[PDB]
Design a protein around this ligand. Structure first.
Ligand SMILES: *C[C@]1(O)C[C@@](C)(OC)O[C@H](/C=C/C(C)=C/C[C@@H]2O[C@H](C)[C@H](NC(=O)/C=C\[C@H](C)OC(C)=O)C[C@@H]2C)[C@H]1O
Ligand SMILES: [Zn+2]
Ligand SMILES: [Zn+2]
Ligand SMILES: [Zn+2]
Lengths: 93, 65, 842, 864
């Protein structure tokens, strides 16, 4: 599988996470010290994708947060953290 | 990596890196107020004139390649 | 090749299945073929395929022409089996081709509208959004004149449905091209002499413009009102009704600004109040109710006194829409500055509670919510006791819906205001009614629980005389056969524990706690979690020494409950054990605590973050209670023995112990566990150090020196996992002690991290780059630039690649700082390279 | 030993880089929001008393690069949009009840620091408050859409991209297009062609363009609509009102020209800037505007444009059928060069000068009634010919208030010269003819000021008489003698042209001297200089002696010393450079003037001048002889009856020496780019040997040795460092690297450092004075308990009370080097500014009460 980050200009949408990855950093897969709130671009939050998990793409239950390490290194300024698969379409789940 | 202008590769020339760092320095002078203050005092020019001269230098800071 | 095709796609892409050859078919057929290919790559393609196909279909939209492009797109857009994201992609390609096509779509505008307009009435909100977006792009591409010429013939239609459709679409084009562009057309149509259908349609256009644009219509509110005002005195009743409704929409969209714009509408509405009846009367009332919150205090009082006669008259109206309208209008009036509380108490409250607060209203859910919110808003101004006293005696009604209604109303009133306005008689009435409504519950109405809790917490210490009665009722409901009633009683205990403790009635609370102990071990997980939470609240509010049952007998009962699979039971049991460990550790032996800790290690890998946080907190409490030594020895034995799947729990527990009892009681033993020549336990010690430093952050500022030799031994050990985990340790250290004076030890560890940059394996070079960025943060970009410059320009190409990768990381990291760290490069015969501004001397 | 410092700003920065006016209170009163650099201030001028009161001051812990106000349709209170170094856009609303700035919105988009491609430098707003554009210097440009909600609260949207690679932005401004789609005018220039042509033709042919970015609200996207190449490069833009209040369009200010442009069939209307009649500056020198101001009225509107000389011109436009006809310019007045001008209602004008004090004048007369010549663009003129006007004192403005400003502080010395128990701060600051030496006493700071001729560079106190020896140097300035010579040559040229009237005009021009302090000193000639030596009594500020210098001589060092070969007689050496043309740096030679201080330090007599190869930038007395830093060479000089002899020298300093300080048998060389270098000189053998350097390079500006093995230095980039030689360091070794034991970022370029004690009996502290006008102190810690307490206070303030403009405090204080053992007291003292809930929570975290923490902070304040 070929997965990558969106890295588009994020907006006012709040990123969310499902029950499997509650309170986990989307960038470095860390579970310690959630710091800043995750923002995603409008394309990844439009329509049936609103409030959907950033990692897998399922029903999100909590707010996604960066960790303190990513905040200090300013890895939250890079762009939309939405994981996207280059080997699948919009209809694929 | 055209997202970040100053980034480089194994084929980045000395002239490219130096004009990049010169433009970085000029924009930092534009940003930090006390740097512009020092430059306007030493050169004895109005802050507007110093900013205009820096923006003019921003075209070819190091000259033609 | 070609992407996958769904069944329903065949109908739209059958010609692409056969691999025909070009030039054999007509050149017009070759256009359709490429349009099919582009649309198939867009609809069912990968992101790169979609981007390439979008760029291709935009860069050739003029060559393709509007005709075949839309003749292929529109059937696909209205496929009954089209996904929502496919619809969004089609909307986007339509927007792009409309921008490229521009005036070429004028002959096709109508052909598009008859397709798009249904989306504006679809139940899907995003479908309506996409329809509006398509119409906006079409109006921007075709022009205002084309849209007016194409949509005008449907204005005077006698369908009343296509009229609403055309009004909505005209509002969309108005929001697309701006109100001033469509102002002359509206001023002309709203004064049409041909028929009243045109006036009705224009006024509906104004209404939909308001509804769609909201606060954006404030600049042109005067123009809209002056164009629409003449319809209030028209001969047709439908046009007067739509005029009033559009006035209400304009007022709602302009809240709370722009009352002077409605100056020419106040007296017409005021007279129509006394003149009209029926649906027109309701529309006038709605417009007035939405207009009132825009007026000054004195004029609000004047207008409200003028319209309140007819408001009270229509209080007893048979039309349910009329009742909803007048209820909203009352809520709007009594929520504005100017309507005195005494005036509402005198003239509004008696008829309000006479005609509205009737049993029937408690059956319909919409009327239920509307009347509850209106009554709470009334209490928010006229006072809590003035409203509660009129509905408190209804707490003992025979209809359960009416009891639920009055209970929710009292709950919201007392939660928004309080109990300082309540006298003694009203307090007794509240207590009696709450007890009667709670004892007479058919189901488990959560509103009753919320009301009981709210009223108890609002009374505070005033509930003490009734505490024996409430405790007896909670006892009787706790023994109930039904489990949900037991759960509701436990939640009521959890919500009233603090109030019962403040009232100084510890014996009743101890009896409740011993009954909860007796009911512990309930099979139903939700009831067990609720009684665990109740026990937690009781233990937290009461003293551990005088707590009945004793903690000595309570904690061993809680020990096996952690093995339950239900997350609620897990969280509640963990929280109770943590409270016990915090304020009552003296009543428990160290062996029980050790067994609790060993049964608590699994819950560190739970998916629920709340369970993880609770487990961490309770483990920290137990470590503070006992001490680090015994638990740390057992945890190191576990780390040495257990398999790699359960070692992360041990690592997290080690970090918790090191953070709670200071790391100088943990780092020596952890580093000592490295001397054994087994590789797996060495990797485990390295991972423990990594997570420990990442967890303690700033606290590890006094421990980098101690661990530096272990790292420098692992940094150059001829093992890949060793160097990887050691680089992870260095990264977490650097990010943790960032800005606390560790530049010496970190600059030392940099010299051991740097030789590992020329490594081929990816998993280790990733950790090396992470350590390098952490060290850039901790030591500063200057040292990193100093180490990069020596290899930035090297004859070796791979060396240049690696050093430029590191330089790119540093440059993205801190670009503004590097300006003060760049070295000197003297000028040559061709270029100027020295920055002379930085050489100035004052 | 261990240096744990506590930073406290005693005097906030008084300079101003941005100033806007608006109804930030929500009432009819007009207030002024200014930026001091890292400080956001809110001032209110009372129209009754005509005085400016300061209502709010907040340390934002960032670098404000762009500041502007706006209002939404139907609103009654202007908001505040701030562009910082944070990569975040911030919108705030002043609340007069709580007297604070409430962060309404904060949206992230980029990285921190004054970066070249990350927006923050430029800020434009749509005049109807519907959208705001934030732009960088290069490519990146973002547009946010603003609206209201049900409760009339500001709502911001997602950003819309408007980037364009290889595009340098000179200035952005929002265009008043009524209630149409918002538009932003940009002065851009594409450099892609320049870097691909090694002949240089592309750079000389690439011209500046004026482009218009239109934000379509229906399509909800930003598009680059129009783009027109410009004749000459403009330096900034002015928004002329539009809609129903004006004809819309834009005003471009360039070199010696101002143009009006507008999209559509509207032609371009340009007009040359009127030059001063009988101007004394170089004819080749151009004339541009430095700032602008716009005043709208129910009737008409106008603009105020200030030139480089300080002349304010009032500008009006003629319009016929919503189309401009001409640009009317008229000389309004002349005040010092301002960074921003605010034309408030109720007839007032606030002028925030770039350097020196700021002023508030009252507008008495608009000026139209006067017979003074009004210039227009329709007047015929030869291409080279420009208009002429006569400057005169204030006619339409009357000064009603003056705000003191210590910026820019070039040097400072703390000493007791008034023979009081508490020392006074003698601060040589100011720029050009507005420079001054000010005495500061506390007992906030009370100040007195004595004017000076030019910009001071350095000054020393005479120990035997406490009198000050000032050196005042300015670049491209004219000496008094050359000024009179230029006037005489102009008068000679004037008569060669009715001849009786010409001689009378020339005599009247000769007999009239415009005060340089208010009209700006006529300074020109890129290679010229002007230096003056002065003696001053510090108690009454009376000039005891004054020595003018040669036209091409620039003073850069000064010292008072006693020589061993002579008796206790006092000598004064002044290092001077000849024909210093900087950028590109080129110089002829240097001289050292030697004078004999006579009459207990009241006048000096010329002895001899000693020539030398390059610039003598530092002069430090070394017991018997003296030490001088000429270029990259450090020499010892002995006093001879004829000149100054070089008994020994060292030439291994890597770059230019900027400062030299000696203690015992050691000497500390301050390289311009490299850090400090340690040199030891044995009395025997007579040779200076380098025995220690640094591991980090530092652009040093000043220094102050704290003890034998330590030194403290100030950076050009607003940093303070403290380094120390390692233990067991001998002087007969070649290679030693100094350990850095303290690093800190102040946010303002510090130019004076001195270890002293303000109040007698208090703890010794380290006082610094910066170029931005601020004065701060560093106090060392005594016990580890207090250090840990204040460290926890700083940690909790960083998280619970973050900086105002989105910056990270720990990152800001680590701008160029990571923080090392410094606690920011300006952040800690903000504990009293938080809400009671957060104060109670943080105090319970530290096991004490909010009043106890306030009392601890006040104890530190009173200790000093
Ligand atoms: C997004 C995912 O990657 C999807 C999936 C299916 O990936 C395989 O599931 C992932 C879930 C992983 C979990 C739940 C890992 C458990 C780990 O447990 C160890 C013991 C660690 N525990 C902690 O760090 C616990 C507490 C910390 C200190 O504090 C807090 C507040 O969390 C790490 C993991 C939680 C999912 O991520
Ligand atoms: Zn995205
Ligand atoms: Zn997920
Ligand atoms: Zn992270």
């Amino acid at each position: 599988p070929d997965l990558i980050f969106c890295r588009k200009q994020a907006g006012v949408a709040i990123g969310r996470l499902c029950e499997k990855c509650d309170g986990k950093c989307v960038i470095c897969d860390s579970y310690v010290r959630p710091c800043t709130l995750v923002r995603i671009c409008d394309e990844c939050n439009y329509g049936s994708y609103q409030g959907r998990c950033v990692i897998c793409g399922g029903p999100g239950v909590s707010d996604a947060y960066y960790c303190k390490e990513c905040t200090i290194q300013e890895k939250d300024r890079d762009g939309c953290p939405k994981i996207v698969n280059l080997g699948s379409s919009k209809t694929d789940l | 990596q055209s997202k970040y202008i100053g980034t480089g590769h194994a084929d980045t020339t000395k002239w490219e890196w130096l004009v990049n760092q010169h433009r970085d320095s000029y924009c930092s002078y534009m940003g930090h107020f006390d740097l512009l203050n020092y430059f306007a005092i030493a050169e004895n020019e109005s802050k507007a004139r110093v900013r205009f001269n820096l923006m003019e230098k921003m075209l070819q800071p190091c000259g033609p390649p | 090749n070609l992407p996958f095709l769904k069944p329903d796609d065949i109908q739209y892409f059958d010609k692409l299945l056969v691999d025909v050859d070009e030039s054999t078919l007509s050149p017009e057929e070759q256009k359709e073929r490429k349009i099919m290919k582009l649309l198939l790559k867009i609809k069912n393609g990968t992101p790169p395929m979609r981007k390439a196909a979008l760029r291709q279909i935009t860069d050739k939209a003029r060559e393709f022409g509007a005709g075949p492009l839309f003749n292929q797109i529109l059937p696909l857009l209205m496929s009954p089996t089209l996904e929502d994201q496919e619809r969004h992609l089609l909307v986007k390609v339509i927007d792009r081709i409309l921008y490229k096509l521009d005036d070429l779509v004028r002959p096709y505008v109508h052909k598009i509208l008859v397709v798009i307009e249904p989306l504006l009435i679809d139940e899907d909100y995003y479908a309506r959004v996409e329809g509006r977006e398509i119409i906006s792009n079409l109006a921007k591409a075709a022009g205002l004149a084309t849209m007016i010429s194409t949509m005008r013939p449907d204005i005077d239609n006698m369908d009343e449905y296509v009229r609403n459709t055309t009004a909505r679409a005209f509002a969309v084009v108005a929001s697309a091209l701006g109100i001033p562009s469509l102002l002359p057309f509206l001023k002309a149509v709203c004064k049409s002499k041909k028929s009243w259908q045109a006036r009705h349609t224009g006024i509906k256009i104004v209404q939909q413009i308001a509804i769609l644009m909201g606060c954006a219509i404030l600049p042109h509110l005067r123009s809209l009102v002056e164009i629409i005002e003449h319809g209030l005195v028209d001969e047709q009743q439908k046009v007067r009704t739509i005029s009033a409704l559009a006035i209400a929409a304009l007022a709602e969209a302009a809240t709370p600004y722009g009352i002077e714009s409605f100056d020419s509408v106040l007296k017409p509405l005021w007279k129509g109040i006394r003149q009209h009846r029926g649906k027109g009367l309701a529309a006038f009332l709605k417009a007035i109710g939405y207009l009132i919150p825009l007026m000054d205090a004195e004029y609000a009082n004047y207008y409200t006194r003028e319209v309140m006669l007819i408001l009270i008259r229509e209080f007893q109206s048979p039309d349910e829409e009329m009742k909803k309208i007048v209820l909203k209008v009352v809520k709007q009036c009594c929520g504005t500055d100017g309507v005195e509380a005494n005036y509402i108490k005198t003239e509004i409250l008696p008829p309000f509670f006479k005609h509205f607060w009737q049993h029937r209203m408690a059956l319909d859910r919409r009327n239920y919510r509307q009347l509850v919110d209106t009554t709470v808003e009334l209490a928010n101004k006229v006072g809590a006791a003035e409203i509660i006293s009129r509905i408190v005696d209804d707490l003992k009604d025979e209809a359960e819906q009416y009891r639920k209604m009055v209970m929710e109303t009292i709950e919201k009133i007392m939660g928004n205001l309080g109990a300082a306005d309540i006298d003694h008689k009203l307090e007794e009435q509240l207590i009696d009614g709450i007890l009667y409504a709670f004892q007479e519950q058919t189901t488990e109405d959560s509103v009753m629980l919320n009301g009981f809790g709210t009223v108890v917490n609002a009374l505070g210490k005033r509930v003490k005389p009734y505490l024996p009665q409430i405790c007896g009722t909670v006892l009787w409901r706790l023994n109930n056969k039904s489990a949900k009633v037991r759960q509701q009683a436990a939640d009521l205990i959890s919500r009233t524990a603090v109030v019962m403790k403040t009232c100084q009635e510890e014996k009743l609370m101890g009896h409740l706690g011993v009954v909860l102990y007796e009911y512990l071990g309930e099979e139903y997980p939700e009831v067990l979690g609720s009684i665990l939470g109740a026990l937690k609240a009781i233990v937290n509010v009461i003293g551990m020494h005088k707590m009945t049952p004793p903690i000595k007998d309570l904690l061993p009962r809680l020990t096996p409950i952690l093995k339950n699979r239900h997350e609620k039971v897990q969280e509640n049991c963990i929280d109770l054990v943590g409270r016990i460990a915090d304020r009552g550790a003296e009543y428990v032996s160290a062996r029980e605590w050790m067994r609790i800790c060993f049964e608590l290690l699994e819950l560190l890998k739970a998916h629920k973050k709340a369970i993880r946080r609770a487990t961490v907190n309770t483990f920290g409490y137990i470590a503070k209670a006992i001490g680090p030594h015994d638990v740390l020895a057992t945890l190191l034995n576990n780390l040495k023995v257990q398999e790699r799947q359960n070692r992360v729990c041990t690592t997290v527990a080690i970090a918790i112990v090191a953070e709670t009892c200071s790391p100088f009681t943990v780092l020596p033993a952890l580093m000592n566990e490295y001397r054994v020549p087994e590789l797996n336990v060495q990797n485990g010690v390295l991972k423990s150090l990594s997570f420990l430093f990442e967890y303690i952050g700033e606290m590890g500022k006094d421990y980098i020196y101690a661990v530096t030799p272990l790292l420098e031994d692992a940094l150059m050990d001829r093992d890949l996992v060793h160097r990887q985990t050691a680089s992870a340790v260095v990264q977490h250290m650097s990010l943790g002690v960032y800005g606390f004076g560790c530049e010496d030890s970190l600059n030392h560890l940099l010299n051991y991290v740097w030789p590992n940059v020329f490594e081929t394996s990816p998993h280790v070079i990733q950790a090396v780059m992470g350590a390098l960025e952490g060290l850039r943060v901790a030591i500063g970009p200057c040292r990193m630039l100093q180490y990069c410059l020596q290899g930035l320009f090297h004859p070796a190409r791979k060396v240049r690649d690696v050093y430029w990768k590191i330089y790119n990381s540093i440059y993205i990291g801190s670009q503004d700082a590097l300006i003060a760290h760049y070295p000197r490069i003297y000028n040559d015969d061709k270029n100027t390279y020295i920055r002379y501004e930085l050489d100035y001397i004052l | 030993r261990h240096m744990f410092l506590y930073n406290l700003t005693l005097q906030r920065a008084t300079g101003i880089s941005f100033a806007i006016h608006g109804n930030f209170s929500g009432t009819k009163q007009q207030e002024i929001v200014v930026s001091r650099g890292k400080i956001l201030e809110l001032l209110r001028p009372d129209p009754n008393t005509g005085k400016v009161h300061t209502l709010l001051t907040v340390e934002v812990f960032g670098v404000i690069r762009s500041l502007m106000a706006f209002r939404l349709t139907g609103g009654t209170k202007d908001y505040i949009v701030v562009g910082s170094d944070s990569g975040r856009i911030v919108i705030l609303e002043y609340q007069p009840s709580k007297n604070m700035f409430e962060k309404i919105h904060q949206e992230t988009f980029g990285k921190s620091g004054c970066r070249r491609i990350v927006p923050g430098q430029f800020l434009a707003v749509d005049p109807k408050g519907r959208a705001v554009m934030i732009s960088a210097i290069e490519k990146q440009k973002l547009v946010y859409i603003l609206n209201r909600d049900a409760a009339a609260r500001l709502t911001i949207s997602s950003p819309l991209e408007a980037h364009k690679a290889n595009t340098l932005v000179y200035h952005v401004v929002g265009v008043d297009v009524g209630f149409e789609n918002p538009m932003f005018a940009c002065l851009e220039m594409d450099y892609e062609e320049a870097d691909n042509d090694p002949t240089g033709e592309a750079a000389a042919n690439t011209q500046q363009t004026l482009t218009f970015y239109e934000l379509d609200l229906g399509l909800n996207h930003v598009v680059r609509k129009y783009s027109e190449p410009l004749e000459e490069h403009g330096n900034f833009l002015i928004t002329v009102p539009g809609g129903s209040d004006g004809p819309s369009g834009v005003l471009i200010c360039s070199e010696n020209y101002i143009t009006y442009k507008n999209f559509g069939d509207q032609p371009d209307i340009r007009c040359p800037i009127p030059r001063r009649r009988n101007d004394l500056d170089d004819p080749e020198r151009g004339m541009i505007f430095v700032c602008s101001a716009t005043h709208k009225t129910k009737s008409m509107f106008f603009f105020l444009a200030q030139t480089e000389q300080g002349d304010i011109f009032k500008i009006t436009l003629e319009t016929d059928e919503d189309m401009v006809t001409e640009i009317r310019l008229k000389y309004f007045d002349t005040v010092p060069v301002a960074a921003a001008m605010c034309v408030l209602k109720t007839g007032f004008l606030f002028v925030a000068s770039e350097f020196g004090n700021h002023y508030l004048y009252q507008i008495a007369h608009l000026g139209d009634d006067d017979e003074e010549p009004e210039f227009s663009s329709a007047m015929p003129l030869e291409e080279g010919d420009t208009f002429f006007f006569q400057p005169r004192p204030l006619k339409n403005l009357v000064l009603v208030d003056e705000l003191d400003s210590l910026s820019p502080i070039l040097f400072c010395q703390i000493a007791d010269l008034a023979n009081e128990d508490t020392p006074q701060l003698y601060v040589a600051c100011g720029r050009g003819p507005r420079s001054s030496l000010r005495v500061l006493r506390h007992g906030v700071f009370n100040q007195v000021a004595f004017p000076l001729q030019y910009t001071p560079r350095k000054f020393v106190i005479h120990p035997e008489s406490n009198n000050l020896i000032i050196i005042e140097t300015d670049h491209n300035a004219y000496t008094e003698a050359t000024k009179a010579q230029r006037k005489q040559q102009m008068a000679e040229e004037m008569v060669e042209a009715e001849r009786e009237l010409a001689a009378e005009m020339a005599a009247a021009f000769l007999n009239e001297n415009l005060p340089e302090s208010i009209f700006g000193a006529p300074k020109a000639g890129n290679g010229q200089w002007a230096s003056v030596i002065r003696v001053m009594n510090p108690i009454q500020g009376n000039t005891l002696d004054l020595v003018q210098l040669e036209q091409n001589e620039a003073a850069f060092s000064v010292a008072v010393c006693r020589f061993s070969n002579t008796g206790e007689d006092w000598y004064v050496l002044v290092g001077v450079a000849k024909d210093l043309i900087l950028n590109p740096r080129s110089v002829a030679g240097g001289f050292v003037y030697t004078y004999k201080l006579v009459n207990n330090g009241e006048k000096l007599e010329f002895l001899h001048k000693t020539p030398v190869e390059e610039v003598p930038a530092a002069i430090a007395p070394f017991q018997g002889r003296v030490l001088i830093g000429v270029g990259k060479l450090l020499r010892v000089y002995d006093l001879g009856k004829k000149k100054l002899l070089r008994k020994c020298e060292n030439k291994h300093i890597a770059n230019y020496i900027s400062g030299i300080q000696t203690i015992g048998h050691r000497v500390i060389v301050s390289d311009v780019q490299e850090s400090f270098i340690w040199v030891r000189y044995k009395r025997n053998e007579n040779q200076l040997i380098i025995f220690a350097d640094d591991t980090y390079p530092r652009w040093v500006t000043t220094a102050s040795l704290l003890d034998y093995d330590t030194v403290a230095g100030a950076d050009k980039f607003g940093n303070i460092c403290v380094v120390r030689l390692p233990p067991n360091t001998n002087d007969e070794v070649d290679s030693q690297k100094a350990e850095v034991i303290m690093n800190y970022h102040v946010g303002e370029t510090v130019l004076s450092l001195q270890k002293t004690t303000l109040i007698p009996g208090g703890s010794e502290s380290l006082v610094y004075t910066t170029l931005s006008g601020g004065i701060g102190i560093l106090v060392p810690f005594t016990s580890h308990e207090d250090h840990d307490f204040f460290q926890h206070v700083e940690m909790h303030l960083r998280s619970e009370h973050p900086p105002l403009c989105g910056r990270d405090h720990l990152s800001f204080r680590s701008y160029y080097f990571p923080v090392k053992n410094v606690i920011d007291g300006d952040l800690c003292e903000q504990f009293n500014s938080m809400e009671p809930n957060k104060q109670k929570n943080v105090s319970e975290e530290l096991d004490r009460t909010p009043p106890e923490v306030s009392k601890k902070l006040e104890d530190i304040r009173t200790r000093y």
